[PDB]
C-alpha cells in the first residue's frame, strides 16, 4: 500500500502519493517562503521576488532581439525588470480583487493532524499587499544583481 | 456571367429562405409551439421530440450568415 | 476593388440584420389581437407556402447550376 | 419463393435493379447517339 | 434565481416526469382533473439543472411540464467545484 | 405528521480506497450533500465519483459534492440492491437540511399533504404573448 | 476439456427473415413509423450485443461475419489477380520495369472517358495503378498471365469456401461458447499454425521458386525463356547451378551444418543494386527465422496435456505494491467481452500498420519498388490512414466496453479501478502536455513566420539561425550506420540506407534511397507530430475514462454509449457521450495523419527522390527546399501546397484529369460536411414541416413521416463526409503530383 | 471548433483542470473568484461565427489587395 487516501479520507478529491506526501517533499514544500505561515509576508515576498527576478534575466538577455549586440546585457535585463513591474502589478490587482480591508485571513486554521493553527496572514489584504511590495523590491533587486554579476562585475560564466 | 449570376440568385434565394423561415417560425412551429415564450436566442429545447438543436430564430440568423458570406464571396 | 468588396460585405451583413430584427419584432412586439386579418398576419397564415416555394427555387437553382458547372468541368 | 420475391421488392434491391436498368439504357443511348447537344429531329 | 418549471392542467397523471428527474425537483400531488387523480408539482426548482428529462417523457400532445431556462446558480450549472 | 430523521455523524462510511472525484473547495465554502442508507449485506457498489466501493453491513454514510450524485447513487441502490436511502445538505455553518423524501414518501407516488407549486390551470398554448408582458417584470409563464 | 463443442442446426436457412427488415431487434421489427427507422436499420445491423444478451449467439454471428469478410477479401484478391492477368501490361512491365508504368485497369470507350487510358508504356493504354501488385508478383516469381489467372481462380474458389464455411458454422454446425473461450489453444494454433507455418511455407516458396526465378530475371534472361518454377523443383541440379548448397540436400540441416546454406540464406542487409529492393535471400532467411520463433513461441499455453502456461495464472502472478491486486480478474474480463478484445486488437493492428508503412518506406522489400515513387507514396499514405482509423476504433470500442460490459460486482479488476479512481490526474496532466507541446511546437512556426515577415531571418528557428538539432535521432542514425562494424559483425551492410554513409542505390537513373538528413525542420515537424498524437490520445482516453460518470453527469452510463446530450442543463451538456469523443478524435487523427503524410511527401521529394545523372550528380524533385521552407507555415502553403498542386489543377485534358475531378469533388464533399457539422436538427425539422405541407397540399405526402436526421446521425454524417473529402483531396493531389513528375 | 466541438466535452475538461489547480502546491494559494465554466452554446455559436467571419474578411481582403497591388491591373 503506497497510494493512500488524502489524509485517510477517500471522499476528498485527491490522493496521497510519494510525489504528494513524501517526508522529503513535504519538508521542501514547508521550507518554501510561500508556506512559512509564522513569518512576515514581506520577507517571503522579498525572497520570492529575488529568486524570480534573478531567474528572469537569463531568457530575456540570451533570447532577446538584441542578444547578439552590445546592448544585450542592459536592455534585456531592463525587460526582465519591466516584467516584474507587470507581475507585481498583477499581484496588486489580485490583492484588491480577493481580500477586503475589514475581513480577517481566509487561510486554513488546521493542519493534517487536525490541531489548531494560527491562520496564515498572507491570505489577507495587508498581508498580500506586503507580500506584493516585497516581491517588487526583491524582483528589481534580483534583476540588478544578475546584471551586476554577468556584466558589471564581469564574473566568468558559460552564458548558455 | 450567366452561370455566376444564376449562382448569385441561388445564394440570394437560399439566404432569404433561411432568414424568412426563421422570422416566420420565430413565434412557433409544430415542433415547438411556444417558441415565443423562450425569447429570441435560446440554445435548444432538449433532446426530446427527436432533438431540437438550432431551433431558435437566432440560430436561423447564425446559419444564414454563412450563406450570406458565401454569396458575397 | 476594395471599395466594392467593402460595401458589398457591409450590405450583406446589414440585410442579414434586417431579417434578424424582423424575427425579433415577430417574437417580441407582434400583437396577434391587434393584427388580425392584416397583411402581416396573413404571412404567418401562409408561411408554409412561402417557405416551400423558396425551398423549391433554391433547390432548382442549386441543382441546375451545379449540374451545368460539373458538366462543363 | 414468396419471401424471396418480397426481399426482391424491398427498397434497395428494387432501386438497384431500376437504376441499373436506367443507367444501362442511358449508356447504350449515349453509345448509339453520342455527343448530343441539341434536339435536331424536328 | 432558478429555472422555472411549470405544470399545466393537461397532465394525465403519469409519474414519468417525476421518475425522470435527476435532482428531485418534481413530485406527485393529489388532484381531480384527470383519471389518475394526481398532478405534478415543482416545489424544489432551486435544484433544477435544466436537463429537460422530465419533458422528454411527457406523453401529451405538447408538454404539460415545461422547463424555462433562467438565472443560473452553482447547483443550476451542475458545478461540483 | 412525518418527522425527518436526524443525521447521525457517527455513521460508518463505505470502504473506499480514495478517488480524485470526491469533494473540493465547494464543500468548504458552500454546501455538500450526505447520503445515508442501511445495507443488509456487505457488498460492493459503484461510486458516482468513479471507481468501486465496498459498503459495510448496517448503516452507511457517504459525503458527495452534488445532489445529482446523491440521487443517482440512491436510484442505483433502490433499483439494484433495494435499500432505503435518505440524503441531506450540510452547510459550512453546520446546518443540516433533510432533502429527498419531503414527506417520507417517494415523490413518484402520490401522497396527501403536498401543496402545488408552479401549477398553471390552463393549456400550454393559452400563454400570454410577450408583447402583453413587455415593460413588466412578470413573464408569460409566471402569470 | 478443450474439445470441439458444436451444436447441430441451430438456425434454419430461410428467406423469411430476408422479407422482414430489422428482424434482429424488437423496437425496429414493428415496422417503420417515421423515416428515422430506416437509418436505425442501418445503425443496429451489426450491433449483436444489443440484439441478444446471450454470448453464444453473438460469438457465432461474429465468427460467420469474419468468414464473410474473408470471402470478400478473397473475392477482391481474385479480382486484382484477374485484372493483372487480363487488362494489364505485367508481361511488358517485366522486361522494362524502369520505363513502363504499371497498369491493371482500362476504361471503356463511352462519353469520352477513354482519355483516361493513358500511354503507360509497353504498348498498353490504361489507368496507371499504384497498389504495387506488379512488384509483389515479380517478387513471387510470376512471369506469365496464366499464373495470375490460376491465382484468381484459386482465390475465387477460396472465397466460395469461406462463404460456405460462414453459412456452415452458423446455420448447420455452430461452435459453443466454451469453444470460443479456449483462448490458450487459439493462441497456440494462431502462433504455431497460422503465423509460424505460414512463414515457413512462404520461406519454402521463396527458397524454391522466388530465388531462382528472380536470379534469372536479374541476370538479364528474358522472362519467357526462364524455366518454369516447377522445373526447378523436379530438377535439383537446375537450382544447384545457382546455389551449390542444394547439391547437399537437407543433410546439412539435419547435421546442424547450417553454415553450408550460406549461399541462399544470407544476412546481407541493405538493398539489391540491380533491383533497388531487399535481397530475397535475406527475406527467405528472415521468414525461416520468424517461422522457427513463432513455432517455438506457440507451444507456451496449456491445453489438454499438463505442460504449458495458464494465462490466468500468469496474469495473477504479476501484482505490485502500487497496483495492489494487480492483473487478477483480467482473464475473465477479456474472455467474456468481445469489445475489450476488439479495442486491444484494433490498437495493436493500427500500430502494426503504421510501423508497416514506416518499414516499407525505409526498406523496400520488392524489386523496383523504391524507384516507383507513386507506389511508395500510395502505400505509405494508405497504411497510415488505415492505422489511424484502427487506433481510433480501439478507443471507440473500449468506450463500449466501459459503458456496457464493465461492472465491478462481478468481473472486478483492481488495475481498471485504480485507473478510474485517478482519471482526473491523468486527463489534467495530458491536457498540460498537449498545451505545452502545442505552444513549443506551433508557436515556433508562428515565430518563424513572423520573423521572416518582419525581415528578421536571423531570429528564426532555422539551420542558418537558432538551431534545434535532433541530437538523439542523429546519434541513433550514426549508431545504426556503424552497426555492421561492431554491434552486428555478421551483417555485411546496414539494415537500411536511411542512416548514413556514402552508400546510394539508384536504378534506371532514379534514386531509390539516400541517407536522410535530420535538421531543425525535422525537429519541428516531429514535435508537431507528437503534439497531434498527444491531443488525439487526450480526446480518446478522456472519452474512455469518462464514458461512465463524471462530475457533470454522475449517471452517464445509464444514458448509454451513444446518446446526443443531456439537455441544455448545467449550462449545456452537448456531446458528453464517448461516441462524441470518438467523433471529435476522428478529426484530430485526420489532422495528425495529414501532417505526417505531408511531411513524408515533401521530405522524400526534396531529400531522397530524384534523378541520377551519368556524371554522378543527383537532382531531387523539389531541389531540397524542405530545410529552409518547411519551417514556416507560408513555406508549406507556397512551396508544398501551391507549388505541387499545379500537377493536379493542370491535369485537365490528359489521362490524369480524373484526379482533377476528384480534387474538385473532394473539396465539394468536404465543404458539404460543414452543413451537417455546423447546424442542428430543429431547423431542418421545421423546414421539413413546410415541405411536408407542400406535399400534403397535392395529396403526395408519404405515410412514412419525413424526419430530420438525429443529432448523433447528423454528427456522424458530417464527420464521414469531412473525412471522405479531406482524404480524397490528398489522394488525388498526391497521385496526380507523383504520377506526373515521378 | 466553436462550431463543431460542443459544450459538454469542454466542461468535463474544465472540471479536471479545476481539480488540477486546486491540488497543485504553490498554486492553491491563488484561487479564482469566478468559477470557470465552458462557453455557452449560443455564446460558442457566436464566437465561432465571429472567428469564421473575421477569417473570411481578412483572408479575402489580403488576397484581393495583394493581387491588385502586386500588379495594378
Ligand atoms: C511558443 C513558443 C515560442 C517560443 C519558445 C519563442 C521563442 C522566442 N521568441 Mg518568439 N513568438 C511566438 C512563439 C514563441 N517564441 C509567438 C506565438 C509570437 C507571436 C507572433 C512570437 C513573436 C516573437 C517576437 C516579436 C519576438 C520573439 C522572440 C523570441 C525569443 C523570446 C524573447 C523573450 O523576451 O522571451 C523570453 C521569456 C521568458 C520569461 C522565458 C520563460 C520560460 C522559462 C525559462 C521556462 C523554463 C521552465 C522550467 C524548466 C519549468 C520547471 C521549473 C522547475 C523549478 C521545476 C525566443 C527566441 C524575440 C526575438 O526576436 O528573438 C529571437 C522577439 O523580439 N518572438
Ligand atoms: C458547399 C457545400 C454545401 C452545399 C452543396 C449545400 C447545399 C445545400 N444547402 Mg447547405 N450549408 C452549408 C454547406 C453546403 N450546403 C454550410 C457550410 C452551412 C452553414 C451551417 C449550410 C446551411 C444551410 C442552410 C441553413 C440551408 C441550407 C440549404 C441547402 C440547400 C440549398 C438549395 C440548393 O442549392 O440545393 C441544390 C442541391 C445541392 C447543391 C446538393 C446536392 C448535390 C448533388 C446535386 C447531389 C446529387 C446526388 C449524387 C447522384 C450523389 C449520390 C450520393 C451517393 C449515392 C454517393 C442545399 C441542399 C437550404 C435548404 O434547405 O434548401 C432547401 C437551407 O435551408 N444549407
Ligand atoms: C444540370 C443538368 C445537366 C444537364 C441539363 C445536362 C445536359 C446534358 N448532358 Mg451533362 N452532366 C451533368 C449535368 C447536366 N448535363 C453532370 C452533373 C455530369 C457529371 C456526372 C454530366 C456529364 C455528362 C456526360 C459525361 C455527358 C453529358 C451529356 C449531356 C447531354 C445529353 C446526353 C444525351 O445524349 O442524351 C440523349 C437523350 C436522352 C437520354 C433522352 C432519353 C429519353 C427517353 C429515351 C424517353 C424517350 C421518350 C418516349 C446534355 C447536353 C452528353 C454529351 O455528349 O454532352 C454534349 C455526355 O456524354 N453530360
Ligand atoms: C474487387 C472488386 C472488383 C472490382 C472493383 C472490379 C472492377 C472492374 N472490373 Mg473486374 N473482376 C473481378 C473483381 C473486381 N473487378 C473478379 C473477381 C473477376 C473475375 C470474374 C473480374 C473480371 C472482370 C471482367 C471479365 C471484366 C471486369 C471489368 C471491370 C470493370 C467494371 C465493368 C463492369 O463490371 O460493369 C458492368 C456491370 C454490371 C452490373 C453488369 C452485370 C454484372 C453482374 C451483376 C455482376 C455479378 C455477376 C457475376 C471495373 C474496372 C470489365 C473490364 O474492365 O473490361 C474492360 C470486364 O469486362 N472484371
Ligand atoms: C492451425 C490452424 C488454425 C488456423 C490456420 C487458424 C486460422 C485462422 N483463424 Mg483460428 N482457431 C483455431 C485454429 C486455427 N486458426 C482454433 C483451434 C480455434 C478454436 C480455439 C480458433 C478460433 C478462431 C476464431 C474464433 C476465429 C478464428 C479466425 C481465424 C482466421 C483469422 C486470421 C486471418 O484471417 O488471416 C488470414 C489467414 C488465412 C486465409 C490463411 C489460410 C488459412 C486457411 C484458409 C484456414 C484453414 C484453417 C482451419 C482451422 C482448418 C480447416 C478445418 C477443416 C474442417 C476444413 C484465420 C483463417 C477468425 C476468423 O476470421 O474466422 C473466420 C475468428 O473469428 N480462429
Ligand atoms: C497487453 C497485452 C496484449 C496484447 C498487446 C495483445 C495483442 C494481441 N492479441 Mg490478445 N490477449 C491478451 C493480451 C494482449 N493481447 C490476453 C491476456 C489474452 C487472454 C484472454 C489475449 C487473447 C488473445 C487471443 C486468443 C488472440 C489474441 C490475439 C492478439 C492480436 C490480434 C490480432 C489482430 O490484430 O487481428 C488480425 C487477425 C487475427 C490473427 C485474429 C483473429 C481474431 C481473433 C481470433 C479473435 C479474438 C477472439 C477472442 C478469443 C475473444 C473471445 C470472446 C469469448 C470470451 C466469448 C493482438 C496483436 C490473436 C493472435 O494471437 O493473433 C496472432 C488471438 O488469436 N489475443
Ligand atoms: C475491425 C473491425 C471493426 C468491427 C468488427 C467493429 C464492430 C462494430 N462497431 Mg466499431 N469501429 C471500427 C472498427 C470495427 N468496429 C473503427 C476502425 C472505428 C473508427 C471509425 C469504429 C468506430 C465505431 C463507432 C463510432 C461505432 C462502432 C460500433 C460498432 C458496432 C456496430 C457497427 C454498425 O452497426 O455499423 C453498421 C454499418 C454501417 C453504419 C456503415 C456506415 C458507412 C460507413 C461509415 C462509410 C464508409 C465510407 C466508404 C469507404 C465510402 C464509399 C462511398 C459510398 C457511396 C459507398 C460493432 C460492434 C457502433 C456501436 O457499437 O454502437 C453502439 C458505433 O457507435 N464502431
Ligand atoms: C486551426 C485552429 C485551431 C486551433 C489553434 C485550436 C487550438 C487548440 N485546440 Mg482545437 N479544434 C479545432 C481547431 C483549432 N484548435 C477544430 C477544427 C476542432 C474540431 C475537431 C477542434 C477541437 C479540439 C479538441 C477536441 C481539442 C482541442 C484542443 C486544442 C487546444 C490544444 C493545443 C494547445 O493548447 O496548444 C497551445 C495553443 C495553441 C497551439 C493555439 C495557438 C496559440 C499560438 C501558438 C500562440 C498565440 C500567441 C499568444 C497567445 C499571444 C496572444 C496575443 C494577445 C493579443 C492576446 C488548443 C486551444 C485540445 C485541448 O483541449 O487540449 C488542451 C482538445 O482536446 N481542439
Ligand atoms: C508518470 C507516470 C506514473 C505511473 C505510475 C504507475 C504505477 O503505479 O507504477 C507502476 C509502475 O511503476 C513505474 O515504473 C512507472 C513508470 C512511469 C513511466 C511510464 C512510461 C514508460 C517509460 C507500479 O508497478 P508495480 O511493480 O507496483 O506493479 C506493476 C504491475 O501491476 C505488475 O506488478
Ligand atoms: C426595372 C426598373 C425599374 C423599377 C424597379 C423597381 C420597382 C424595383 C423594386 C425593387 C424592390 C421592390 C425591392 C425590394 C426589396 C425588398 C427587401 C430587401 C425586403 C427585405 C425585407 C425584410 C428584411 C423583412 C423584414 C421584416 C420581417 C422579417 C417580418 C416583420 C416585418 C419586417 C418588415 C421588419 C425602374 C422603372 C425604376 C427603372 C428601370 C429599372
Ligand atoms: S445537443 Fe442539441 S438538444 Fe442537446 S443540448 Fe445541445 S443543442 Fe440542445
Ligand atoms: S407533467 Fe408530464 S409526466 Fe407529469 S403527469 Fe403531466 S403529462 Fe404526466
Ligand atoms: S429539467 Fe431535469 S432537473 Fe429540472 S425538473 Fe426537469 S428532469 Fe428535473
PDB file of N, CA and C and ligand atoms in Angstrom, chain A residues 28 55-56 59-60 62-67 79 83, chain G residues 438-444 446-448 450-451 454 456 458-461 466, ligand 1:
ATOM      1  N   UNK A  28      10.545  20.022   1.897  1.00  0.00           N
ATOM      2  CA  UNK A  28      10.944  21.007   0.898  1.00  0.00           C
ATOM      3  C   UNK A  28       9.836  22.020   0.643  1.00  0.00           C
ATOM      4  N   UNK A  55      16.062  34.709 -11.884  1.00  0.00           N
ATOM      5  CA  UNK A  55      15.937  33.735 -12.965  1.00  0.00           C
ATOM      6  C   UNK A  55      15.347  34.329 -14.240  1.00  0.00           C
ATOM      7  N   UNK A  56      14.664  35.472 -14.157  1.00  0.00           N
ATOM      8  CA  UNK A  56      14.036  36.053 -15.338  1.00  0.00           C
ATOM      9  C   UNK A  56      15.018  36.762 -16.264  1.00  0.00           C
ATOM     10  N   UNK A  59      16.691  34.409 -19.745  1.00  0.00           N
ATOM     11  CA  UNK A  59      15.959  34.294 -21.020  1.00  0.00           C
ATOM     12  C   UNK A  59      15.859  35.593 -21.801  1.00  0.00           C
ATOM     13  N   UNK A  60      15.632  36.721 -21.125  1.00  0.00           N
ATOM     14  CA  UNK A  60      15.496  37.992 -21.830  1.00  0.00           C
ATOM     15  C   UNK A  60      16.817  38.435 -22.444  1.00  0.00           C
ATOM     16  N   UNK A  62      19.473  36.394 -23.221  1.00  0.00           N
ATOM     17  CA  UNK A  62      20.005  35.437 -24.184  1.00  0.00           C
ATOM     18  C   UNK A  62      19.110  35.237 -25.400  1.00  0.00           C
ATOM     19  N   UNK A  63      17.812  35.526 -25.302  1.00  0.00           N
ATOM     20  CA  UNK A  63      16.892  35.284 -26.405  1.00  0.00           C
ATOM     21  C   UNK A  63      16.225  36.555 -26.913  1.00  0.00           C
ATOM     22  N   UNK A  64      16.643  37.723 -26.437  1.00  0.00           N
ATOM     23  CA  UNK A  64      16.042  38.968 -26.849  1.00  0.00           C
ATOM     24  C   UNK A  64      16.405  39.339 -28.273  1.00  0.00           C
ATOM     25  N   UNK A  65      15.710  40.333 -28.832  1.00  0.00           N
ATOM     26  CA  UNK A  65      16.045  40.786 -30.191  1.00  0.00           C
ATOM     27  C   UNK A  65      17.440  41.373 -30.307  1.00  0.00           C
ATOM     28  N   UNK A  66      17.997  41.888 -29.211  1.00  0.00           N
ATOM     29  CA  UNK A  66      19.339  42.455 -29.195  1.00  0.00           C
ATOM     30  C   UNK A  66      20.347  41.534 -28.516  1.00  0.00           C
ATOM     31  N   UNK A  67      20.132  40.217 -28.593  1.00  0.00           N
ATOM     32  CA  UNK A  67      21.001  39.272 -27.901  1.00  0.00           C
ATOM     33  C   UNK A  67      22.389  39.182 -28.524  1.00  0.00           C
ATOM     34  N   UNK A  79      14.120  44.605 -19.679  1.00  0.00           N
ATOM     35  CA  UNK A  79      12.879  43.903 -19.980  1.00  0.00           C
ATOM     36  C   UNK A  79      12.466  43.019 -18.818  1.00  0.00           C
ATOM     37  N   UNK A  83       9.080  43.163 -16.711  1.00  0.00           N
ATOM     38  CA  UNK A  83       8.168  42.064 -16.420  1.00  0.00           C
ATOM     39  C   UNK A  83       7.804  42.049 -14.944  1.00  0.00           C
TER      40      UNK A  83
ATOM     41  N   UNK G 438       1.750  21.942 -27.925  1.00  0.00           N
ATOM     42  CA  UNK G 438       1.191  22.832 -28.928  1.00  0.00           C
ATOM     43  C   UNK G 438       1.904  24.165 -28.977  1.00  0.00           C
ATOM     44  N   UNK G 439       2.145  24.760 -27.810  1.00  0.00           N
ATOM     45  CA  UNK G 439       2.892  26.008 -27.747  1.00  0.00           C
ATOM     46  C   UNK G 439       4.296  25.809 -28.302  1.00  0.00           C
ATOM     47  N   UNK G 440       5.112  24.991 -27.644  1.00  0.00           N
ATOM     48  CA  UNK G 440       6.502  24.854 -28.074  1.00  0.00           C
ATOM     49  C   UNK G 440       6.673  24.069 -29.388  1.00  0.00           C
ATOM     50  N   UNK G 441       5.620  23.728 -30.127  1.00  0.00           N
ATOM     51  CA  UNK G 441       5.762  23.173 -31.464  1.00  0.00           C
ATOM     52  C   UNK G 441       5.200  24.069 -32.554  1.00  0.00           C
ATOM     53  N   UNK G 442       4.030  24.678 -32.347  1.00  0.00           N
ATOM     54  CA  UNK G 442       3.402  25.522 -33.354  1.00  0.00           C
ATOM     55  C   UNK G 442       3.709  27.000 -33.176  1.00  0.00           C
ATOM     56  N   UNK G 443       3.911  27.468 -31.940  1.00  0.00           N
ATOM     57  CA  UNK G 443       4.358  28.832 -31.752  1.00  0.00           C
ATOM     58  C   UNK G 443       5.738  29.066 -32.323  1.00  0.00           C
ATOM     59  N   UNK G 444       6.543  28.008 -32.445  1.00  0.00           N
ATOM     60  CA  UNK G 444       7.817  28.133 -33.146  1.00  0.00           C
ATOM     61  C   UNK G 444       7.603  28.404 -34.632  1.00  0.00           C
ATOM     62  N   UNK G 446       4.899  29.892 -35.835  1.00  0.00           N
ATOM     63  CA  UNK G 446       4.376  31.258 -35.861  1.00  0.00           C
ATOM     64  C   UNK G 446       5.509  32.265 -35.697  1.00  0.00           C
ATOM     65  N   UNK G 447       6.454  31.963 -34.806  1.00  0.00           N
ATOM     66  CA  UNK G 447       7.617  32.811 -34.586  1.00  0.00           C
ATOM     67  C   UNK G 447       8.472  32.909 -35.841  1.00  0.00           C
ATOM     68  N   UNK G 448       8.700  31.779 -36.517  1.00  0.00           N
ATOM     69  CA  UNK G 448       9.469  31.790 -37.758  1.00  0.00           C
ATOM     70  C   UNK G 448       8.761  32.594 -38.840  1.00  0.00           C
ATOM     71  N   UNK G 450       6.634  35.062 -38.399  1.00  0.00           N
ATOM     72  CA  UNK G 450       6.671  36.478 -38.056  1.00  0.00           C
ATOM     73  C   UNK G 450       8.059  37.066 -38.270  1.00  0.00           C
ATOM     74  N   UNK G 451       9.109  36.324 -37.907  1.00  0.00           N
ATOM     75  CA  UNK G 451      10.467  36.813 -38.119  1.00  0.00           C
ATOM     76  C   UNK G 451      10.783  36.948 -39.604  1.00  0.00           C
ATOM     77  N   UNK G 454       8.787  39.973 -40.881  1.00  0.00           N
ATOM     78  CA  UNK G 454       9.338  41.225 -40.382  1.00  0.00           C
ATOM     79  C   UNK G 454      10.731  41.508 -40.924  1.00  0.00           C
ATOM     80  N   UNK G 456      13.490  39.533 -40.453  1.00  0.00           N
ATOM     81  CA  UNK G 456      14.481  39.130 -39.457  1.00  0.00           C
ATOM     82  C   UNK G 456      14.739  37.635 -39.593  1.00  0.00           C
ATOM     83  N   UNK G 458      17.499  36.044 -39.208  1.00  0.00           N
ATOM     84  CA  UNK G 458      18.461  35.569 -38.224  1.00  0.00           C
ATOM     85  C   UNK G 458      17.820  35.225 -36.886  1.00  0.00           C
ATOM     86  N   UNK G 459      16.556  35.590 -36.681  1.00  0.00           N
ATOM     87  CA  UNK G 459      15.855  35.332 -35.431  1.00  0.00           C
ATOM     88  C   UNK G 459      14.951  34.110 -35.492  1.00  0.00           C
ATOM     89  N   UNK G 460      14.892  33.420 -36.627  1.00  0.00           N
ATOM     90  CA  UNK G 460      14.019  32.265 -36.766  1.00  0.00           C
ATOM     91  C   UNK G 460      14.666  31.028 -36.151  1.00  0.00           C
ATOM     92  N   UNK G 461      13.927  29.925 -36.165  1.00  0.00           N
ATOM     93  CA  UNK G 461      14.455  28.626 -35.754  1.00  0.00           C
ATOM     94  C   UNK G 461      14.834  27.798 -36.981  1.00  0.00           C
ATOM     95  N   UNK G 466      18.970  30.213 -35.096  1.00  0.00           N
ATOM     96  CA  UNK G 466      18.833  29.429 -33.870  1.00  0.00           C
ATOM     97  C   UNK G 466      18.482  27.993 -34.235  1.00  0.00           C
TER      98      UNK G 466
HETATM   99  C1  LIG I   1       5.521  29.119 -28.142  1.00  0.00           C
HETATM  100  C2  LIG I   1       6.788  29.144 -28.158  1.00  0.00           C
HETATM  101  C3  LIG I   1       7.600  30.316 -28.623  1.00  0.00           C
HETATM  102  C4  LIG I   1       8.891  30.340 -28.218  1.00  0.00           C
HETATM  103  C5  LIG I   1       9.607  29.340 -27.355  1.00  0.00           C
HETATM  104  C6  LIG I   1       9.505  31.537 -28.762  1.00  0.00           C
HETATM  105  C7  LIG I   1      10.781  31.877 -28.554  1.00  0.00           C
HETATM  106  C8  LIG I   1      11.441  33.076 -28.808  1.00  0.00           C
HETATM  107  N1  LIG I   1      10.890  34.142 -29.384  1.00  0.00           N
HETATM  108 MG1  LIG I   1       9.012  34.032 -30.478  1.00  0.00          MG
HETATM  109  N2  LIG I   1       6.938  34.206 -30.836  1.00  0.00           N
HETATM  110  C9  LIG I   1       5.991  33.239 -30.608  1.00  0.00           C
HETATM  111  C10 LIG I   1       6.235  31.938 -30.082  1.00  0.00           C
HETATM  112  C11 LIG I   1       7.399  31.528 -29.449  1.00  0.00           C
HETATM  113  N3  LIG I   1       8.596  32.221 -29.490  1.00  0.00           N
HETATM  114  C12 LIG I   1       4.689  33.761 -30.982  1.00  0.00           C
HETATM  115  C13 LIG I   1       3.394  32.998 -30.878  1.00  0.00           C
HETATM  116  C14 LIG I   1       4.867  35.046 -31.442  1.00  0.00           C
HETATM  117  C15 LIG I   1       3.811  35.999 -31.933  1.00  0.00           C
HETATM  118  C16 LIG I   1       3.841  36.176 -33.458  1.00  0.00           C
HETATM  119  C17 LIG I   1       6.308  35.327 -31.346  1.00  0.00           C
HETATM  120  C18 LIG I   1       6.962  36.520 -31.700  1.00  0.00           C
HETATM  121  C19 LIG I   1       8.226  36.933 -31.225  1.00  0.00           C
HETATM  122  C20 LIG I   1       8.722  38.263 -31.181  1.00  0.00           C
HETATM  123  C21 LIG I   1       8.032  39.555 -31.662  1.00  0.00           C
HETATM  124  C22 LIG I   1       9.992  38.150 -30.612  1.00  0.00           C
HETATM  125  C23 LIG I   1      10.194  36.795 -30.343  1.00  0.00           C
HETATM  126  C24 LIG I   1      11.412  36.490 -29.753  1.00  0.00           C
HETATM  127  C25 LIG I   1      11.662  35.270 -29.168  1.00  0.00           C
HETATM  128  C26 LIG I   1      12.609  34.980 -28.039  1.00  0.00           C
HETATM  129  C27 LIG I   1      11.952  35.387 -26.677  1.00  0.00           C
HETATM  130  C28 LIG I   1      12.365  36.673 -26.088  1.00  0.00           C
HETATM  131  C29 LIG I   1      11.805  36.909 -24.759  1.00  0.00           C
HETATM  132  O1  LIG I   1      11.606  38.055 -24.430  1.00  0.00           O
HETATM  133  O2  LIG I   1      11.169  35.933 -24.096  1.00  0.00           O
HETATM  134  C30 LIG I   1      11.867  35.204 -23.014  1.00  0.00           C
HETATM  135  C31 LIG I   1      10.851  34.968 -21.893  1.00  0.00           C
HETATM  136  C32 LIG I   1      10.906  34.161 -20.818  1.00  0.00           C
HETATM  137  C33 LIG I   1      10.475  34.641 -19.426  1.00  0.00           C
HETATM  138  C34 LIG I   1      11.066  32.627 -20.893  1.00  0.00           C
HETATM  139  C35 LIG I   1      10.266  31.808 -19.874  1.00  0.00           C
HETATM  140  C36 LIG I   1      10.495  30.320 -19.980  1.00  0.00           C
HETATM  141  C37 LIG I   1      11.044  29.740 -18.666  1.00  0.00           C
HETATM  142  C38 LIG I   1      12.567  29.794 -18.669  1.00  0.00           C
HETATM  143  C39 LIG I   1      10.535  28.322 -18.508  1.00  0.00           C
HETATM  144  C40 LIG I   1      11.503  27.204 -18.157  1.00  0.00           C
HETATM  145  C41 LIG I   1      10.595  26.147 -17.498  1.00  0.00           C
HETATM  146  C42 LIG I   1      11.068  25.398 -16.232  1.00  0.00           C
HETATM  147  C43 LIG I   1      12.209  24.427 -16.547  1.00  0.00           C
HETATM  148  C44 LIG I   1       9.872  24.665 -15.573  1.00  0.00           C
HETATM  149  C45 LIG I   1      10.103  23.940 -14.251  1.00  0.00           C
HETATM  150  C46 LIG I   1      10.673  24.780 -13.129  1.00  0.00           C
HETATM  151  C47 LIG I   1      11.403  23.955 -12.063  1.00  0.00           C
HETATM  152  C48 LIG I   1      11.816  24.805 -10.876  1.00  0.00           C
HETATM  153  C49 LIG I   1      10.514  22.828 -11.586  1.00  0.00           C
HETATM  154  C50 LIG I   1      12.732  33.465 -28.139  1.00  0.00           C
HETATM  155  C51 LIG I   1      13.912  33.087 -29.039  1.00  0.00           C
HETATM  156  C52 LIG I   1      12.204  37.802 -29.731  1.00  0.00           C
HETATM  157  C53 LIG I   1      13.349  37.765 -30.761  1.00  0.00           C
HETATM  158  O3  LIG I   1      13.183  38.212 -31.872  1.00  0.00           O
HETATM  159  O4  LIG I   1      14.365  36.967 -30.515  1.00  0.00           O
HETATM  160  C54 LIG I   1      14.660  35.879 -31.404  1.00  0.00           C
HETATM  161  C55 LIG I   1      11.171  38.862 -30.198  1.00  0.00           C
HETATM  162  O5  LIG I   1      11.507  40.042 -30.390  1.00  0.00           O
HETATM  163  N4  LIG I   1       9.095  36.061 -30.689  1.00  0.00           N
END
